[PDB]
Amino acid sequence: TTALVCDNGSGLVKAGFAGDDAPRAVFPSIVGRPRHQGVMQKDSYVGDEAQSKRGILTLKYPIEHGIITNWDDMEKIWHHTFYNELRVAPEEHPTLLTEAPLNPKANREKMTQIMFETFNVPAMYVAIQAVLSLYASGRTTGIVLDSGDGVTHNVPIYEGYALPHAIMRLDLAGRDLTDYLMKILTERGYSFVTTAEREIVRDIKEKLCYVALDFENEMATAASSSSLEKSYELPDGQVITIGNERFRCPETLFQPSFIGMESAGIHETTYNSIMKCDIDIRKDLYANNVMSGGTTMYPGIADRMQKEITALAPSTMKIKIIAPPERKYSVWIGGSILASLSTFQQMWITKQEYDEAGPSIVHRKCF
Amino acid sequence: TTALVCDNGSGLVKAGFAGDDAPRAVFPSIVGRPRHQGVMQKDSYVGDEAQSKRGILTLKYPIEHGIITNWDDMEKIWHHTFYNELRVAPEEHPTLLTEAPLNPKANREKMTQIMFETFNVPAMYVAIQAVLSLYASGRTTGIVLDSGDGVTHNVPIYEGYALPHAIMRLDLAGRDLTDYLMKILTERGYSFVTTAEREIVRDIKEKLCYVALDFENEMATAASSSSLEKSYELPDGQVITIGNERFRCPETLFQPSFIGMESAGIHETTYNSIMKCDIDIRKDLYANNVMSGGTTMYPGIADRMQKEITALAPSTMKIKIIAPPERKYSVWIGGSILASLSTFQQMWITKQEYDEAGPSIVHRKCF
Amino acid sequence: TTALVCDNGSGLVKAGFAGDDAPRAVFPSIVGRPRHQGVMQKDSYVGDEAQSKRGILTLKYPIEHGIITNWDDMEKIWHHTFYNELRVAPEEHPTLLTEAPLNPKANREKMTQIMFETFNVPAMYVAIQAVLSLYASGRTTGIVLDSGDGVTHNVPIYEGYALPHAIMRLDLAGRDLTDYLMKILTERGYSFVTTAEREIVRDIKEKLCYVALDFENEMATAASSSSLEKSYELPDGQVITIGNERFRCPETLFQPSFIGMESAGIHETTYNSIMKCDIDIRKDLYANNVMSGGTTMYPGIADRMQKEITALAPSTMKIKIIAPPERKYSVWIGGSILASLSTFQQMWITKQEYDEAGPSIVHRKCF
Amino acid sequence: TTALVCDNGSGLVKAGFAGDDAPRAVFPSIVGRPRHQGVMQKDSYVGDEAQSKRGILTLKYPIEHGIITNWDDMEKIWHHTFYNELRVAPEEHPTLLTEAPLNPKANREKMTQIMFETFNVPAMYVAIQAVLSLYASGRTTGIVLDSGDGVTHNVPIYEGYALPHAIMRLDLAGRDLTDYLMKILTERGYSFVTTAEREIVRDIKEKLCYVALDFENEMATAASSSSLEKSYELPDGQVITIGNERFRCPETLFQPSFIGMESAGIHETTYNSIMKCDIDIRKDLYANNVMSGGTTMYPGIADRMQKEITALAPSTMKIKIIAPPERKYSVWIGGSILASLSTFQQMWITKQEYDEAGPSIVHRKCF
Amino acid sequence: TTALVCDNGSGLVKAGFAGDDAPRAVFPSIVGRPRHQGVMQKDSYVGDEAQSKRGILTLKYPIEHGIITNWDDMEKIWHHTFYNELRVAPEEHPTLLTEAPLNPKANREKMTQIMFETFNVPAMYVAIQAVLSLYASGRTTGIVLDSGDGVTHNVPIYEGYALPHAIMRLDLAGRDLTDYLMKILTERGYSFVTTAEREIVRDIKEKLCYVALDFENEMATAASSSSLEKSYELPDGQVITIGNERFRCPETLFQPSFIGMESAGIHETTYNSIMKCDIDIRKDLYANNVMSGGTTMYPGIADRMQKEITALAPSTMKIKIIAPPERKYSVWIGGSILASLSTFQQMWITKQEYDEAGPSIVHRKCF
Numbered sequence A, B, C, D, E: 001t002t003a004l005v006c007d008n009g010s011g012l013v014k015a016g017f018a019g020d021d022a023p024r025a026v027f028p029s030i031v032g033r034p035r036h037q038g039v040m041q042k043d044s045y046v047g048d049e050a051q052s053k054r055g056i057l058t059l060k061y062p063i064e065h066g067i068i069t070n071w072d073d074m075e076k077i078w079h080h081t082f083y084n085e086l087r088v089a090p091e092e093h094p095t096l097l098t099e100a101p102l103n104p105k106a107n108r109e110k111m112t113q114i115m116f117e118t119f120n121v122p123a124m125y126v127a128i129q130a131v132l133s134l135y136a137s138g139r140t141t142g143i144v145l146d147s148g149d150g151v152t153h154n155v156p157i158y159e160g161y162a163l164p165h166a167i168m169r170l171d172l173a174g175r176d177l178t179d180y181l182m183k184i185l186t187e188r189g190y191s192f193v194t195t196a197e198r199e200i201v202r203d204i205k206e207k208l209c210y211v212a213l214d215f216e217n218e219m220a221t222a223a224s225s226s227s228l229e230k231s232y233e234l235p236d237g238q239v240i241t242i243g244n245e246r247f248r249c250p251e252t253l254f255q256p257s258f259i260g261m262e263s264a265g266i267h268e269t270t271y272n273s274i275m276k277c278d279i280d281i282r283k284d285l286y287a288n289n290v291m292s293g294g295t296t297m298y299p300g301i302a303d304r305m306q307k308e309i310t311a312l313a314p315s316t317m318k319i320k321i322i323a324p325p326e327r328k329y330s331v332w333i334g335g336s337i338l339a340s341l342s343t344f345q346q347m348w349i350t351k352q353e354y355d356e357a358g359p360s361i362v363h364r365k366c367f
């Protein structure tokens, strides 16, 4: 049987069969529960059902910053992924799961236990997202800036060797930019407070927000013109209108101090990840920055990333930012390649081998 | 045995057997007592007998604004409902009673005690009228504007969940419009003063009154034409003739300030009930306004309700007012459906369980 | 023992035993005393003896307008009623006496005292004449126009409830029409002056007088033809001849201004009695006008009464005047029914109860 | 010129000049017409002339229950008010007329037309009687119980705002108590029947009748003593003597069921008028009951009114009944104040403005 | 001249002169307008005048949730604050205004424009309420839980640095607890509906309501004893009696789900505000919770707040809740300190500087 590839991100579940070139099931990775008692019935809703029904539900994300915080809701979301969205018996297919680097070891151990004991999967693996995202680009060398809903991380790879000491990780990604857009929308007098209202602010961010190429020149232009200012229609048909908020939101990727986060931005953390590498590989990394995940989808993000890294880099270096179309799925496409390589079929952790060695056996290639 | 469904409204008793699609007994819910001593004998008359005999009687309504104010007259009206109008032993049939939301808890408790101890009913329930009225329409989602003789209330329901915080209630309905029509009839020189004369003014209201689509354009037209002006023949064969009074009466549903009532009208209280709901359900509520009860029967009431809510609503929303024929009975038809559902037979409060838990057990699904 | 029923009217005593359908004793209710001394002996004559002997007597009526004005003559007339005309021991039979409404309370009290202390009657009652007259018709609803020798009164009754506030009473009846016929006979040159001559004018009225259907068309016809003109033979065999006097007399029932009486006529007082009633009963009263007593016996009185009330009534109403044959006795026939009802035997005022409670006990159902 | 103030009540015309503190002309408001033809001449008499001459006249009141029922007799009574009793050219003085609340609109319209077109008055107003009666007391807040010959009405006013929804009106006042005293006088054997005899019964009521503080204790005392029993001398010098009739008459203000009137009495209608008001003003109304008009003049009426309202009121409230001396004129004194206020001269409806706007302009402050 | 300090809260205006230790003017911040037309005059009433007169008025609050929704009513309330309650020329005194955090920027801009252009104030500032409330306590470090009529917000401050990212704001405060107490009073059969009746429910809440230390043990005790049950006398002297309603009301601060509000309660939002802070300051915040504003005045609120935060906190931490007497004014007392500091006189926005820089200049220290 062909393998399942389940990217299982913190803000979308992306799942499908290895060798397909887009995921079959892509759904919100939310569990919702009724706020109000029924008078007229399903206790909880998962994914797109909890989006369609979201006004009456509190929405929980069981994954935050790539760490599974509620396990019973994650077992619901996996159960729906296999039985309802893929419509597959999971005990017949090896499943390539996926994780961020530098997660707690217990997160991978308890995930592996749930796969072998609840779902009875025959064989399993857990890849690092930014390794897979490099397979999707075809490259063997590059520094992969992957930024999802939960985590941003740089993994530098050179000719197929990882550099574990150079892996950087930011707990700043799409959800922290939703939580910040809600605060700067509050300055126009738009108040969003419910978990179900944050799912509206997310669609605002996904439609209206872009990256300013020169932040303080856009701040001047929005302070002098309403050409930057656009409108958006709520599910109620009320119309909100937002201005410099359109680029002040993604700017928080480059100035995390906006959210009170003491950190380098994604430019300085990418340059620092490059600078922790040996001088000889550094030129090959500069020419192969690979962007992936949804938070790299903002209009003009690569165009500014190139000009910030060019400003940090020594001026002889060619800086190139490889941000392909469909970089939103490149972690899943990379896993869909990997799971179908003949060289990889050696690496599946088999059920027998997990019954033998226990949860020790799961970190054999782990960061 | 099949259940009894007793809508037991403040201005009509509607009662029958579950699974029938119209009530058997529909009678005025009045107790009358002789004003004059007999010289020529029944101490009190109930319902249609107190209408036929009404000239010699003072008529009391034992229910006002959905609250049972005289219990001995309510025990008379129930006794006649069971033994004379349905001709049924009540101790053999479970009875679905009915109530407005936000009534005093003691009203339901003392009603339940009278059913279990006087009439010895085997099992009982008390539904909210606007839940039932949604079952009658078949819909699982909508905002139900129910307006009887005593109470107007909006109950919003979304996919079978109630939203208790959004339930609105107006103490303004058909009886307050009778009491106001008597005052504006007094301007033509028609004086109605007796309780038995108000039962004439009620039939005037039920026959001649309609809703003006543009109130101040009808007020101009009645100020310039006698095409709006109609006549009506009293029980004495005297002829009265009424003009802008025909629409100034129901207008008090939309401008309660006419009766010195500080309130939103039924349009603004329906829109406010919609606006207390989460933005996601709001579009589904706008398309499913359900009208019910007798005070929604005026010609053109839905046609104006649609155009007032369209004026408050944001202009992208489809506004639809589902006002079916027989909406005068839809509370009873809803209860006649509910009482016959297999899923509902779990919910009957049994006599044994009331002897066990006391009047605590009666509010388990209550607003 | 069976009860005595004594109608004891102001111009005839009608008396008999309950359950008979005509009175046994019907006699003039007159006491006469010799005008001239005897030379050739009874001091006073009562009833038919004072009619046979009337030329030598002054005739007194002890009742005027239903009020007993001379009590010693009323005790004579009762004594003759019991001992000579019925030939009954009064102390063995309960006696249903009778009265007009709105009489002085003392009239009923002193009548009751005379029955309990002179005649020693065991039990007694005093009914209102127009209640009894409705029992005679069998009806439970109607407005009873009773017109005797002394009083005209309307009592409206609806389904066995009296309406005390709507009871009307006219001090205009058969004796005032005798006194007016004597004045308009004086215009033909016939002078009647003695009390014994008024008993001739009464028989003229009872034989020749009728009700004109259109008074001023009969006045024209009598002014142009002697077809309306009839003759009558006195006890002396002298012949008098009377013309428009035949209908100008009863017309005084409809235009009391002829006798200088400021009043509505019997049509307008019947319509006014109907109009003091609640609108709901009014239609049932219009269809059930019941005529009774001797002054309703004129030819064509119901035929004009119907056409005057039809002229006052609103044109949709059915007006019907129930004037049966034997309406001259219907007060007595009603009392003869009432006294024989089992439900009524509760109501006799017993001698013991009068000795206990005094003359307070006599007005328990009184107008 | 100073204004005329014409209270124009249903049982007295009270008229005078604004700024005087008692009316000049106070006369019966009666038109009388000869019952009998002249043989020895004025066709009709008005006011005090129709009282002095009343034995030969039928007396009509052109106003009944505050509604002008005969307009030609009302134009006679106004003509005599201006030309004979005030001796004034009406076309030189603005006239403050007066009305009850809740009268037919046509009554005020036809009154205004008669003033502008027959009498040619320059400017006119029509005040509500119970507003004026509050100006007479000086108070800005209170509930005014005004009871005349035709109407009783409560108008609650709080700090100079009327509460139209709380205005109560009873068609029960001094004339209905004359018509009831004639019926209970008939129980002593005194029969009053002529319109001119009712003007005797009125003076009996005005002299002998009082309010019992505890009705059934006075009924017991009159049933046991002749200390409550007084005598009165007719215009014929005949002496009548009346007992519990002295207080059973005014008691009909508190138990209207005595006249077959289904209603609250003046205590319960005053308390109900207070209870239709918002809770915050209610304490200020309880302390400021203002009595006015002639039917409040009975000895002890305020003393019982205070003790009935104290019995209905919640026991913490101070109840005070402000019944001043000269409350018989306080409607006219209030109008005499109002007409002389500078702030009021804005409000006169001018002849020019009535020719412009028609009878629409007359209800600008109307109930 | 000394500065004015105007706290200008959503439910009270508190105003005075800097350096005084209690405000001079404290008044309701209400504008009321007559519901009824005058017949006997001020178009609108402000503050304590609209409380004294409230029965006849609709009351509007121009501030809701700290946002000024009606500007013309806010200009009335400021005009009365300066000219009538303080009796001061505002153009001679710099005025420290005040605001909640995270308000719309336009609210502060339009407030500043009204001060500089209508009232012509020479210099102005707008402080954050929870900064001021810390100055009142004297502390330089603490987390300030301020809860007024409109907003609850936590502002954590450490040694005089704010932590903008940790500022939490709840749209749940005293007015939402009045609106909820009206709904749970409706369960005893007490219906409060008018805006003027909500001002009665507010005084019920302020007198009878307290915080249960163990909510479900008080719910059991009130379900078993009437020792928790107290009575209160309306302005009408009617007596209402309320039981578990006394603590179910304030419990909505801790379980907002009672009002259908998806939120943490004030305990969990205070703990979450502490947890968004860096670990080193967290111990210093736990020992310095500062309570302020009126909704913290309930008996026992600090005693439960301490025991909920102790339950969330890690057990080694000292938790202390600094809830001083007069915490109801501590925002104003803090502003009265701040306005008198010499170091602060640098910070006044001068009129000249506002004419120069425009409404940009107003957010220089803003959240």
Ligand SMILES: Nc1ncnc2c1ncn2[C@@H]1O[C@H](COP(=O)(O)OP(=O)(O)O)[C@@H](O)[C@H]1O
Pocket (backbone or CB within 6 Å): A008, A009, A010, A011, A012, A013, A014, A147, A148, A149, A150, A173, A174, A175, A202, A205, A206, A207, A292, A293, A294, A295, A297, A298, A328
């Ligand atoms: N086109 C877009 N523009 C901006 N942001 C986006 C876009 N698509 C997704 N995002 C944001 O990125 C996150 C989803 O990224 P994704 O890579 O799907 O996450 P995951 O790795 O959890 O699947 C969300 O925060 C979403 O708001």
Ligand SMILES: Nc1ncnc2c1ncn2[C@@H]1O[C@H](COP(=O)(O)OP(=O)(O)O)[C@@H](O)[C@H]1O
Pocket (backbone or CB within 6 Å): B008, B009, B010, B011, B012, B013, B014, B147, B148, B149, B150, B173, B174, B175, B202, B205, B206, B207, B292, B293, B294, B295, B297, B298, B328
């Ligand atoms: N066809 C009609 N048109 C207008 N009003 C009506 C009509 N039918 C009933 N009503 C009014 O509505 C009330 C009766 O409504 P209903 O729904 O039967 O009340 P309940 O819920 O008490 O049974 C009465 O006030 C009646 O006057």
Ligand SMILES: Nc1ncnc2c1ncn2[C@@H]1O[C@H](COP(=O)(O)OP(=O)(O)O)[C@@H](O)[C@H]1O
Pocket (backbone or CB within 6 Å): C008, C009, C010, C011, C012, C013, C014, C147, C148, C149, C150, C173, C174, C175, C202, C205, C206, C207, C292, C293, C294, C295, C297, C298, C328
């Ligand atoms: N057939 C008749 N036609 C006209 N008048 C009659 C007739 N019979 C009796 N009356 C008159 O009516 C009165 C008697 O009526 P009646 O009902 O017998 O009186 P009472 O009620 O006193 O018995 C007398 O005035 C008599 O003249």
Ligand SMILES: Nc1ncnc2c1ncn2[C@@H]1O[C@H](COP(=O)(O)OP(=O)(O)O)[C@@H](O)[C@H]1O
Pocket (backbone or CB within 6 Å): D008, D009, D010, D011, D012, D013, D014, D147, D148, D149, D150, D173, D174, D175, D202, D205, D206, D207, D292, D293, D294, D295, D297, D298, D328
């Ligand atoms: N002193 C009095 N005692 C009792 N009743 C009186 C007195 N004065 C007048 N009335 C009665 O009140 C009515 C007159 O009241 P008034 O206020 O003058 O009426 P109007 O408002 O029509 O002028 C009449 O019915 C009269 O009988």
Ligand SMILES: Nc1ncnc2c1ncn2[C@@H]1O[C@H](COP(=O)(O)OP(=O)(O)O)[C@@H](O)[C@H]1O
Pocket (backbone or CB within 6 Å): E008, E009, E010, E011, E012, E013, E014, E147, E148, E149, E150, E173, E174, E175, E202, E205, E206, E207, E292, E293, E294, E295, E297, E298, E328
């Ligand atoms: N002693 C008290 N007990 C309970 N609640 C109170 C008390 N005093 C005021 N409140 C409530 O708190 C709010 C007023 O708080 P306050 O701090 O004065 O508000 P603002 O910040 O708007 O001035 C009102 O809702 C009032 O009902």
Ligand SMILES: [Mg+2]
Pocket (backbone or CB within 6 Å): A007, A009, A010, A129, A148, A149, A293, A331
């Ligand atoms: Mg991902």
Ligand SMILES: [Mg+2]
Pocket (backbone or CB within 6 Å): B007, B009, B010, B129, B148, B149, B293, B331
């Ligand atoms: Mg109903």
Ligand SMILES: [Mg+2]
Pocket (backbone or CB within 6 Å): C007, C009, C010, C129, C148, C149, C293, C331
């Ligand atoms: Mg008779």
Ligand SMILES: [Mg+2]
Pocket (backbone or CB within 6 Å): D007, D009, D010, D129, D148, D149, D293, D331
């Ligand atoms: Mg008057």
Ligand SMILES: [Mg+2]
Pocket (backbone or CB within 6 Å): E007, E009, E010, E129, E148, E149, E293, E331
């Ligand atoms: Mg505040």
